[model samples]
Target: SPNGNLIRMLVLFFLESELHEHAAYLVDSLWESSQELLKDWECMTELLLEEPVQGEEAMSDRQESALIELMVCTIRQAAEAHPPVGRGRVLTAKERKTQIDDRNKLTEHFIITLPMLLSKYSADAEKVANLLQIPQYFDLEIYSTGRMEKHLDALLKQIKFVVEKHVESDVLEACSKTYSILCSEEYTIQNRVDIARSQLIDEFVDRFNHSVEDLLQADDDDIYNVLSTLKRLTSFHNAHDLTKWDLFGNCYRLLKTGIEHGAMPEQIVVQALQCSHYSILWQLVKITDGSPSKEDLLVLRKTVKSFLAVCQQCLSNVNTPVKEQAFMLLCDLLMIFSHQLMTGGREGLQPLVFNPDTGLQSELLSFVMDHVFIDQEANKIEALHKRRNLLAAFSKLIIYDIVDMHAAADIFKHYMKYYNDYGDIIKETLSKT
Candidate 1:
């Protein structure tokens, strides 16, 4: 069979020379002939399933590794030569569609054939995957279709494969590289990316959290790996427009469940808060109208409530790092909502801070007040530093508007006694025209 014979030919050709130039030439030739090899997909798969042999005899590692090296180089070359998915204004519709169709055919054949390639040549599986070069192609499809649900599903499976099977290896690096390429630039391919993220983030976070839960039951390096994975994903969260993905909502639900069941650790709570702060801050940045939309307002309300619950739990813990982190997050939480708190009259602000008849706003104010003005000797340096930030945020809330003139005056009177350093700054902020 032409498919089976190609493997044998690639192996012996390597024996012709050990020089890298020979390897390059052989790979180029295979790529040129790949159309013929891949033309009959099912036949190619069946033939690939069988072992590479010469005259009905199994090939040796010496032979197999040579085939692997050649294939890896050839696949990389082929993948690079294939046209990349265009973002926008880069290609005509007719030309773009034609190039993408050709690209899809080639990538699909390679990736679908990948499993059998690994199943038969198990030793080379990692090498093959590292050079697959299919992730970016999947990313490209989104620009054309405006959403590539099926294609992204396939790409997600491949990423999960790396994280699960070869996380400590180069496979993770390859997968992460592709993720950055897809996520890097914001407005360039914004709609395509936004749609992809809407679906992909939920699916990706689900898998990541599942793996974390599973590894939490194990020992040693597993925690490092899982946390590293989360940290990488967190980096992605920060790099993209946070408003585009709903990762915060997913983490918040997990945080809420953890709180109700009392199952979360200080570490977990702090990480969730980190993501929450980013999501809220980014969402606020998108509010060019200086007012939250109905959708944004509903989500921000829930976001703060859940975050407050999580932070409350973290602060109550005895862990110093967790408590300090929680305190900082609480301050950031207020900074984000301070806009809503200060934007309109008490009517608009009350819904965000108070429980129908109860004064939950008082609780937050007290937390900020005692931590700054009343408390002493509890990590005072750090506490005072955070207090400055907290006070600055609180001043904006107070100086900008009138929820209760008499009430705010009483609180400002109390703050002025100890907050003399910021007195002028506060006075200046209030004098804005």
Candidate 2:
């Protein structure tokens, strides 16, 4: 006997009064009521979809805003009610099963309504920001379904627009959150990478470069949002076309400025390193290919040296992931250098790898021997493949006489333990030595 109009009116009043908890409770209760009564939910949706009548524009717009807020609040409450199963939560099998059922019901409800909301609100930055939160409360598979494909595109386009058109810190942050979710491993949309490459990457890089160039004057929040988006973008496979954009140079400049000014966060520094590393590798691949000019080699050598210096600084970071990333990046650098020397010979790599003042060659040898070979952590089963690779690369250097035979003998004495893994390569290198 509850009046649908009366319930909608009360919910709207609660939302306007900022009693979002009450509105959410009312909405949740309504959802749990009989299916026939659920059509009342359409009352708020209809109000949201309503266009501004010419005379009452302000009133209608205010109501729509409240409606969207109520929807966001409701989703949040639903999420709280049926939280994801986690190891930290002590729940019996029956309790977990109940939780799953409730979550599935919530997801089903959103699956029906979300597309309509997106279609209506995609262009409205504030509304879209609220709508974005709706997806976060559920598995992304809801969006990946055939039904929601176009809505996903609409959502993505609106996110791009918000990021590009708005400088508001909160909106930009929301855009970053949306990108993180869409690009996550669970959301298997076929063209997500391609779409990001063609549409989003340039915008993200431009935003980052703009903020970076004005490092001191730029909003710290804006830079963080853009850098976060860039990090997510780069994590995609084959997404390293950043060389064309000079992403490495920009990131390096940003990093150097941030560090010198003591403005850099450890997390940002790590992300900057991660982003720039891909471009550096891309550039190296290009330069190492057929007939790079002397100018290119010189420039690349300088970039590599600067990057190595930064990586060296990162080695002492208290953050374990940063230290590990820097270490692995060094291993990659060394491997590429050794491979170039072995195949293309010393002539092509002489400018890149040889630096007498820096003691670059000896430093690399020490890195391999001390950190890679002798380190207890590096000897673990999980690290065996990387250990094998570094050893093989070092073996190439020894065979080519880049590393002196005396040092190689000592290194090989320790490396002989891995003969089962690299017997052929080590045996050949040993014969050459």
Candidate 3:
């Protein structure tokens, strides 16, 4: 009886008319049929006139396949009315409309409104879905498609329209423009250098390649998913530790450029550094000539506040490893500062450390020497006893670390003088320590 009235109205409408042009509006009685029908005429005419060519090489194979599958399925469904099966009888169009209306009414009730309803009523979409006894939620996506293929098809068409009109579909434009850059051999050197220098920017561009196979699968995929993807890529590549190979300096400079350009959405670094918890502590431990965004600084302050909350909650569980993890993270954070100061740029701490103000060379030596040569309590208990392995890890983590960092600085500072001055300054300075 719940859908009986709606079904009756749809039957009456169907008996009077052959089609429901705006199927969604059919049940919402607040709007008139003519208004609902007439408004979409413009879109319908435009869509119909395009002579859907099964994607005439304008889209990629992946895009074409998705578009064709949806088109075939839609054409088949409309062409052959799915008769009431097992009844061995044909049903009138009105009766079929009633069935479709019933399903659609349930979809909006469950899919769109259910999450909020559950939050308020202490229910769950998963549980309600379980009660329905369906293994999967049978609901329409925002584009009114139930499959990824269908959604992809519609998105491509929409993108085509936007391109034709010289407009933008933020997510699709992001996809097109990003690919257009990385795939081409024709990018400006500045753009190429930007990608080479910033791990975040490079990672973001690479995500366009990786995420396509599963693009927009999760509900609200556009929201913070870029951040999520970067986290995954960073973890996989072991690049989260920015102390190596100019990563710290490069990211710092990239973020500064982002602020100066001020054209990118503020969320780019906001989301990235959110995931890089240790980087925040690095900044607190030691400031650099590298400038962070004004927005980033404000957000970092708030993150510190939120982090204390998380620590508060975490420490409440007596068995939690909260303190230990915090210590390791802080240690790693300090490593970024150490690597940066020891090996940053022509204009940065590199010059200060190597050509130090007469008296301060000893202080710089002490700081740099600790990171490179210290036998930490964890690893090198007897530096002389395990001389080979100790030196190996130390040399790699220290010398090559600075070597690679300097490699990216774009200015060698006359290597002979630079190396001679640095080695002499640090050697004499270490004797004082």
Q: On a 0 to 100 scale, what is the lDDT of residue 108 in model 3?
A: 38
Top-scoring candidate (TM-score):
2
Stretches of candidate 1 exceeding 4 Å from the true structure: 1-207, 215-227, 242-246, 261-263, 280-358, 374-383, 400-433
Clashes of 3: 0
TM-scores of the candidates in the order shown: 0.39, 0.43, 0.19
Candidate 3 lDDT by residue in tens digits, 234-353:
332232333232233323332343344533224434323333454454444434445545564455455444443332222222231332232223223334435354543423333222
- Report lDDT (CA) for all predictions: 0.54, 0.61, 0.35
lDDT per residue for candidate 2 within 1-433, as digits (tens), equals: 2443554575467656755454455555555453234333455565565564576433455556666776666555445543223311466786566556645655656656666676666667677667767666665676665466666665566566555555444555566665655666453563573476456667666666676665545577766765665554445313335577777776687567655664566666767787778887778777767578889988987888888877766665656556556666665566565445545364766777642233545555666765566655645776777667666765655565655657768766777667757888878999988
RMSD of each: 14.8, 14.9, 25.2
Arranged by lDDT with the best first, the candidates are: 2, 1, 3
lDDT of 2: 0.61
Which of 2 and 3 is ahead in TM-score?
2
Per-residue lDDT tens digits of candidate 1, residues 1-433? 6666765665676776665355656555455456445233344345446654576877665665565555444444444554223310255675566455656665665545554454454344455454444445433533435443444445445554544444333444455556566555455454544555545556656666675667544455554544554554554455455455566765676467556665555565566667777776676566534665567666667766767767766655556555556666665565545545555453444445522112434544555555546644668677677768766655554554412335556766776775677878887899994
Clashing pairs in 1: none
